[PDB]
């Protein structure tokens, strides 16, 4: 009911540094909708609940994607726009603290365990199917979809990495760090909007709506 082959297919189907990062975020929000449509059973949920799940998880979903994309580089983040933000550039722009959190708690840990694209997609599908999201018409159905994702994820881990019995738990235990980092990035983005001297495009602005 939740095969990892379709979750990987969704990942492969979607392929001032503050300004560059905000422009990449808006670009990838469009791509995020196309990704979620390719996750099994997401498009079958009520349309209001599809909206709720994406508005609740977009920041974590985008952070996981560019963090995994950046395991190929050191002390840097690869943006979807083809630009690279070096650790030194982020520090010199005043956002070095949260940048270092992304490199240390996400990118380096992804690189250390060689997290593959199937595991990334499954973790993102778990984040997407967040049954704690407020306003869900049927939270039990979302919880059931989440359960099917991590059931398929564990089977994949035991089959492809039988020598790493703790790998399934290691993947899930990056989710608290992703949640904390996602919340801090939202905090920064609201401050940028309040000051008003950072260009924020329309889709990124819409995610900041009440």
């Amino acid at each position: 009911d939740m095969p990892v082959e379709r979750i990987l297919e969704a990942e492969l189907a979607v392929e001032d540094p503050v300004t560059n990062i905000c422009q990449a975020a808006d670009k990838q929000l469009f791509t995020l909708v196309e990704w979620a449509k390719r996750i099994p059973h997401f498009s079958e949920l009520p349309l209001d609940d599809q909206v709720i799940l994406l508005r609740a998880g977009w920041n974590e979903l985008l952070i996981a994607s560019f963090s995994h994309r950046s395991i190929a580089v050191k002390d840097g983040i690869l943006l979807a726009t083809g630009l690279h933000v070096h650790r030194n550039s982020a520090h010199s722009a005043g956002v070095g603290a949260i940048f270092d959190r992304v490199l240390t708690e996400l990118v380096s840990k992804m690189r250390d365990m060689q997290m593959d694209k199937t595991e990334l997609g499954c973790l993102r599908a778990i984040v997407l199917f967040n049954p704690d999201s407020k306003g869900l018409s049927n939270p039990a159905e979302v919880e059931a979809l989440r359960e099917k994702v991590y059931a398929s994820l564990e089977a994949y881990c035991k089959h492809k990495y039988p020598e790493q019995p703790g790998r399934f738990a290691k993947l899930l235990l990056r989710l608290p760090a992703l949640r904390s980092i996602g919340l801090k990035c939202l905090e920064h983005l609201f401050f940028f909007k309040l000051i008003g001297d950072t260009p924020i495009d329309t889709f990124l602005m819409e995610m900041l709506e009440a």
Binding site: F30, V33, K37, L47, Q50, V51, L54, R55, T202, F203, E206, E209
Partner: peptide, 10 residues
């Protein structure tokens, strides 16, 4: 949430 709504329906 105009943009998200339009993108999901299409």
């Amino acid at each position: 949430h105009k943009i998200l709504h339009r993108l999901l329906q299409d």
